[PDB]
């Protein structure tokens, strides 16, 4: 049957790699799609461009625009797939907004949750993989992946720590499954894949 | 000194923009503009090998363009930077990544490795991305083509892929990147680019 599976984690958690590798394994046996907001949905792309073009934009305005883009992605892409009985793998969803805008940026987690409950109208994921990386491991991955940087500055280090603190508060319901993302990526992929098959096959 | 690159797909107004921005900048800054390989003889000779090729392997092409890029860098750009000049360049590593790495399918991590070898740590201080939507870009190309009234399918698909490659590169949110809305009339694209550059130089 259908399943809406989201992937969450801070920068440096291996998330992009993980979702892609898992998608490539799952597609052999499941009617699966992989997406990331706005996912090619034109209204979502237009909304997101307003944020990209913003100049010192108010963070609550940004959050509302992201929530609107989220809804467009959900109604025009995700829900149609779930109605066809597909497995939908989504790279970031409500929890990202809560950790980044709510906690790290300081709007407030409850405030951003209220906004996002309006946007999703009850459509919480069936399963959410939290790629649980420590700040230090994540930092090295971020430096490695960053084309132009060899060390992170203090502002970036602190923000990364605050995002992790936020996610830790959020994950402390049954939809969340944590995977140890401090392991080599090959193991993070394997643990994630096994977590998902157990959910899908109800074993 | 500042090394500033301009990037964007065909139909982004790049040629017009760099030329007009340079004209204004010359009045107030010690600045030069160069079109890679910039008349550097070795860079030109290396490039000619590609231009005269017959069904040449794309990796061979990429390595030759990288060697040509390095000659431009060591013989023309770096000496100008060392003299305190601002150097505007019409294409650089982001173009190779979007075109060769993503669109032509060599692989982004592979082209990144080659780019890194070629530049030996010399990243732009500032990169202006002329962010055009595929549809406006398409229409600009048709407008500027004296021999075509419509683009063929293959060319449309390739254009879309290059834009998608650039979108992945700016999703990385590196501070050197600054996105300019290239869907606007060119007069506005020029103005926004010029204001972006002066803000950086006066910081």
Swiss-Prot record, chain A:
Q: Which UniProt keywords apply?
A: ATP-binding, Kinase, Nucleotide biosynthesis, Nucleotide-binding, Transferase
* Entry-linked HAMAP family: Thymidylate_kinase
Q: Which organism is it from?
A: Staphylococcus aureus (strain Mu50 / ATCC 700699)
Q: Quote the InterPro entries the UniProt record gives.
A: P-loop_NTPase, Thymidylate_kin-like_dom, Thymidylate_kin_CS, Thymidylate_kinase
Q: What is this protein called?
A: Thymidylate kinase
| Annotated catalysed reactions | dTMP + ATP = dTDP + ADP
| EC numbers on record | 2.7.4.9
Q: Which GO terms describe its biological process?
A: dTDP biosynthetic process; dTTP biosynthetic process; dUDP biosynthetic process
Pfam families in the cross-refs = Thymidylate_kin
User: Is DNA damage given among the entry's keywords?
Assistant: no
């Amino acid at each position: 049957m259908s399943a809406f599976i989201t992937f969450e984690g801070p920068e440096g958690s291996g998330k992009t790699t993980v979702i892609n590798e898992v998608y490539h394994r799952l597609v052999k046996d499941y009617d699966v799609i992989m997406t990331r907001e706005p996912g090619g949905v034109p209204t979502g792309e237009e909304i997101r461009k307003i944020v990209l073009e913003g100049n010192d934009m108010d963070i609550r305005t940004e959050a509302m625009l992201f929530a609107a883009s989220r809804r467009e992605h959900l109604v025009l892409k995700v829900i149609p797939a779930l109605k066809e009985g597909k497995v939908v793998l989504c790279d970031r969803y409500i929890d990202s907004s809560l950790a980044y805008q709510g906690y790290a940026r300081g709007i407030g987690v409850e405030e951003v949750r209220a906004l996002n409950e309006f946007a999703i109208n009850g459509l919480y994921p069936d399963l959410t993989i939290y790629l649980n990386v420590s700040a230090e491991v994540g930092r090295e991955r971020i430096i490695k992946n960053s084309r132009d940087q060899n060390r992170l500055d203090q502002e970036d280090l602190k923000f990364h720590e605050k995002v992790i603190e936020g996610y830790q508060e959020i994950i402390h319901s049954q939809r969340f499954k944590s995977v140890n993302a401090d392991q080599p990526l090959e193991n993070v992929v394997e643990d994630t894949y096994q977590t998902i098959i157990k959910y899908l096959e109800k074993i």
